[model samples]
Target: MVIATIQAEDHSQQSGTQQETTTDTGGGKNVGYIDAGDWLSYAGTPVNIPSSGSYLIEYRVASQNGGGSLTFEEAGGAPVHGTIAIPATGGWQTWTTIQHTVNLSAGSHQFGIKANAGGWNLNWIRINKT
Candidate 1:
């Protein structure tokens, strides 16, 4: 069975110099604010899984330039899924969901996203246990 979990960007435990802002175009009003050399974290996120296994990590993002990438990792730990591409969605309101596969423990933990090259905006992240 596939179970889906959604975490809004506004609900994340934000860190660094960036901050969350409200947008009417994205899927949610709140979004992960990312500047160059910024690392945003989401602490104690409830990601309960049936077992320890692989899951799909989906990132809702939008970019006008779309030349940079974002790296997902465990907060204060090693990288989770390396770096994912951020494609141009025409405008900030033109959002899309990008996904990758990663293995996670069967419990809640801190997850993070670090801006590798910036020039992108994030709305939310969805995890699907498969």
Candidate 2:
């Protein structure tokens, strides 16, 4: 399948408490000040999974102090898909791609990301065949 890139600021819905701001080091925008329980959804911009199989989930993230994590799943946690640790990228504006293989069924679904921990900024999330 072709890559699907969802901008963090393009989230159709998100935890009302999260911060939406312009990027300091990147070209576009990002979601910052994310804390535990905070989340973002691409319900209004659902991706069409070409097939049911392992897919490479990539997240553009950064944390100054680290110890952060985000959960990837179908919206609402019905399946609680996958989790990735957000590493310390040295600075808040410093960016890195956090990627992992995850199983997803073939279909159109709203993608979601929930903060398992805090202290990170999200630029975008990409879905590609593994």
Candidate 3:
């Protein structure tokens, strides 16, 4: 599950973009209009390792251009985890799943995602242990 929506967390690195348009599924709106410097941060996210060294970070995203990229890191930019590129799904609400794998400790973590490019929308991210 993700810690964000069309709105933002209480505090942010800076004011950013997200919209209240219909999402593919959830009754919530997806975070959108991310530019190269836009970012979303959370105090912490609830994550349990479940004995898997490698976790698949699945993002529910959609885009018209899909030429954007996003990266997550330990809050305050401390150990940058990874980034994934987006792929066009025809429409802003047309959903597609993109993923990245990262090795983490057998416990919990805190992190935030930042936009490396633009032109994509994020609904949520599924932390899957596989």
Per candidate, the number of residue pairs that clash is 0, 0, 0
| Sliding window of 10 residues with minimal summed lDDT for model 3 | 2-11
Q: TM-score of predicted model 2?
A: 0.92
Q: What's model 2's lDDT at 85?
A: 95
Task: State model 3's lDDT.
Answer: 0.70
- lDDT at residue 123 of model 2 (Cα atoms): 88
TM-score of each: 0.77, 0.92, 0.81
lDDT of 1 by residue, 14-128 (tens): 5543435645353345454556577666665645567788888888777877886878777764756667888988876677788888877776666777777767777677777
Question: What would the per-residue lDDT of candidate 3 be over residues 25-127, giving only the tens digit for each residue?
Answer: 7556677778998877764444555563777788888889778898876666667888888998898889887888887666666667788898988777667
* Residue 32 C-alpha lDDT in model 2: 89
Q: What lDDT does each candidate get?
A: 0.68, 0.85, 0.70
Comparing 1 with 3 on TM-score, the higher-scoring candidate is 3
Provide the lDDT at 111 for model 1.
Answer: 73
What ranking emerges by TM-score with the best candidate at the front? 2, 3, 1
lDDT of 2 by residue, 56-93 (tens): 99988889999999899878776767999999999888
